[PDB]
Design a protein around this ligand. Structure first.
Ligand SMILES: CNc1ncc2cc(-c3ccc(-c4cccc(C)n4)cc3Cl)c(=O)n(C[C@H]3OC[C@H](N)CO3)c2n1
Length: 295
C-alpha cells in the first residue's frame, strides 16, 4: 500500500537532521538501513542515527510498530529513542549511542565470570519486567540486541519483532525470532506469551557461558528441529557452574511455561545476588574491542 506508507510519514516529523546533529560518521550498514554516529550541536550528546529509504523497505507496518513501541516504552535498560526525521523519501531514526558496543563481541571473545553474567542478566530482566508489564513481548532477545555503555550499562535494542498483546488477545502463534534463541513453544506454533523472552534470555546466558547458543554449528532449520525435539538444551560442561547459576538457567529454560519464571520472579533469584558492579564489564569491553580490531 501507499496508504501504509502515508501512515508512516504521518507519525514522523518533517525537518533536517543537520539542524540539530552534525559530525555524521558511518559505523555500518544493515539489511534495513545505514547506521551512523553523531553529535548534538548544543549539548554534546553522542547519538546513533539510522538512515533508511522507505521506497525500498518492504513491510512498512513493522517500521511503524518499532517506532511506536520505542516512543511509548522508555526505560533505563532500553536504548532510548530521541527523535526521527522525515527527509523526502528517507527516514532518519535517532537513538542513544552506546559506545561499549554489542554484548555479542564480549560473548565471542572473552570469558565472563558468574558475577559479570549475573549483572547483565539482572539488567536485562529489569527491561523485560518493564516491557512485560506493558504488554510488550520483545521476541528477539539475544546478545546481538544488547548494547553496552562505556560504563558497563546494559541496554536492550531492536524492537522490530516485538508484539503487543491485550486481554482480548494475550498470546501469539507465529514463528517469530532468531532460530537458536526461540522458545520451543514458538518453534512448534503453540500459543505463547511473555515468557518466550525469558527462554531467549536463558539462551543468552548460555552464550555468556559457552560463547554460542546451542546448535550454532547447525543450520537454522536443523536447529529449529533440534529445539523442537530436545527441549531444555544441554550444557557442554554443567559441572563448571555454581548450584545457584544452574538453578537460574533451569528456571529460564523450563519447558513448562507455567513453571518457567517470569521476569519479576527471576529478578529475585539468588544467582543475581552474586552480581558484580556494572563497572566490571569495562575490561570485557576493552578485550572485545582489541580482539575485533582486524575485523
Ligand atoms: C554500537 N553502539 C550502538 N549504540 C546504539 C545503537 C543504536 C541503534 C539503533 C537501534 C534502533 C533503531 C530504530 C528504532 C526504531 C525504529 C528504527 C527504524 N530503528 C535505530 C538505531 Cl540507529 C543501532 O542500530 N546501533 C548499531 C547496531 O548494530 C547492530 C547490533 N546488532 C545492534 O546495534 C547502535 N549501536
Amino acid at each position: 500500500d501507499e496508504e501504509i506508507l502515508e501512515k508512516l510519514r504521518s507519525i514522523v516529523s518533517v525537518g533536517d537532521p543537520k539542524k540539530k546533529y552534525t559530525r555524521f560518521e558511518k559505523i555500518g550498514q544493515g539489511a534495513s538501513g545505514t547506521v551512523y554516529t553523531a553529535m548534538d550541536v548544543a549539548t554534546g550528546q553522542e547519538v546513533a542515527i539510522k538512515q533508511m529509504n522507505l521506497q525500498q523497505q518492504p513491510k512498512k507496518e513493522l517500521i511503524i510498530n518499532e517506532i511506536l513501541v520505542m516512543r511509548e516504552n522508555k526505560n533505563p535498560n532500553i536504548v532510548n529513542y530521541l527523535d526521527s526525521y522525515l527527509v523526502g523519501d528517507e527516514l532518519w531514526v535517532v537513538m542513544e549511542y552506546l559506545a561499549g558496543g554489542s554484548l555479542t563481541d564480549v560473548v565471542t571473545e572473552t570469558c565472563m565470570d558468574e558475577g559479570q553474567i549475573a549483572a547483565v542478566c539482572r539488567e536485562c530482566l529489569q527491561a523485560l519486567e518493564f516491557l512485560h508489564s506493558n504488554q510488550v513481548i520483545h521476541r528477539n532477545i539475544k546478545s546481538d540486541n544488547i548494547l553496552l555503555g562505556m560504563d558497563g550499562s546494559v541496554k536492550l535494542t531492536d524492537f522490530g519483532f516485538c508484539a503487543q498483546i491485550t486481554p482480548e488477545q494475550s498470546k501469539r502463534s507465529e514463528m517469530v525470532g532468531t532460530p537458536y534463541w526461540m522458545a520451543p513453544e514458538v518453534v512448534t506454533r503453540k500459543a505463547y506469551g511473555p515468557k518466550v523472552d525469558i527462554w531467549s534470555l536463558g539462551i543468552m546466558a548460555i552464550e555468556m557461558i559457552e560463547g554460542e547458543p546451542p546448535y550454532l554449528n547447525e543450520n537454522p532449520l536443523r536447529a529449529l528441529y533440534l529445539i523442537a525435539t530436545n527441549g531444555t538444551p544441554e550444557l557442554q560442561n554443567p559441572e563448571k557452574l555454581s548450584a545457584i547459576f544452574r538453578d537460574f538457567l533451569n528456571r529460564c529454560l523450563e519447558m513448562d511455561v507455567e513453571k518457567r519464571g517470569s521476569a519479576k520472579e527471576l529478578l529475585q533469584h539468588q544467582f543475581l545476588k552474586i552480581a558484580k558492579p556494572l563497572s566490571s564489564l569495562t575490561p570485557l569491553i576493552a578485550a572485545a574491542k582489541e580482539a575485533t580490531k582486524n575485523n
